[PDB]
Design a protein around this ligand. Sequence first.
Ligand code: L01
Length: 374
Amino acid sequence: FVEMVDNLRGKSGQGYYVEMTVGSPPQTLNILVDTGSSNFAVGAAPHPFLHRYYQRQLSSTYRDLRKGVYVPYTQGKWEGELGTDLVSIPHGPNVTVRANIAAITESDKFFINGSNWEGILGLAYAEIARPDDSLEPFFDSLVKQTHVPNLFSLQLCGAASVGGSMIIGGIDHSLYTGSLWYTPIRREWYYEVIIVRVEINGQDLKMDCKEYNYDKSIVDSGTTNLRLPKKVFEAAVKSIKAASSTEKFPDGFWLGEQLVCWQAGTTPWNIFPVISLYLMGEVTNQSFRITILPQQYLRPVETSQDDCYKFAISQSSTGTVMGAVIMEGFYVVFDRARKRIGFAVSACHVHDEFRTAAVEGPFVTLDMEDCGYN
Ligand SMILES: CCCN(CCC)C(=O)c1cccc(C(=O)N[C@@H](Cc2ccccc2)[C@H](O)CNCc2cccc(OC)c2)c1
């Protein structure tokens, strides 16, 4: 689908956006791609951080729906006015749909100063769409009204600016190597999945696997880090710290709280451990794993003029989150038509000489559904 190849742009830590058009004639907006939420919301007022915004007065195709919406994310908040209008995606499929659109009229800590997107495309399921599930997420409208197959895939790169591909309706083998392995979407709300084993440098964390998914493990392009649940994080960092005892760092650093720096020619990569998450496979008692490097969890922050990095694993309280730390390692297929998410080694994932991100199977794991949570 070389039409859609390379249709995602971004800057480090400001997410990935796609161009879309809204209303007739078409207003062009840069919309953040987010599998972590389910609302298509766009700036409709001249906030000073925005390059552009939706002007509903300019579109003959606009239809108020005389309802207001609040949408609070973990990080952020916006208030809006619900309507509908016609939505195309220049470098996606060649269609045009009547999608719901929240017109953002008030926001706090939502938009990012210096960024180049003006909206957010929530690609997850109605069950978390605000204000309630009657509000039909864009992708559901897209499928319900076109013949575009019920799936999309994401190749998030990031070599300053990043890039990538959102293939809508399909998959493109030029974007990955090896085979796609698939883990079932456990519930259609977020893209929730189950992690059944966690390894650092090949060494199990001998932990009840129910912790790994407490109370959720989810796939979120709208998030930067790998977010391990509090106790698994406490324990994850414990072995990460211990495998990388070679060198010393402040304890705050691991809690996020301050960069750490090195030489512009060699950093100690071969000195932090690869991380492996085993994920529920498609078959009774079969799992597989995805393995990331530190060229994923140690990401640059652009006093400094040396090849430097931040620690990108952090704690949470609404689950595990496989943000871009994970996603940038892999080509990820959101197979909604089959209640399942596929991972394959990404063609662009940034590695080194020795190691590499991998996707491997099958493995034998008993009692995978007990790793879940109710
Ligand atoms: C995305 C680029 C960098 N950012 C945003 C800057 C703060 C992050 O790395 C980040 C960090 C923490 C949390 C979030 C976040 O809340 N992401 C949501 C999408 C988003 C919002 C604002 C700006 C950019 C991206 C994402 O939807 C969270 N998924 C969980 C969730 C919680 C509550 C309600 C939900 O759906 C209604 C979803 C993003």
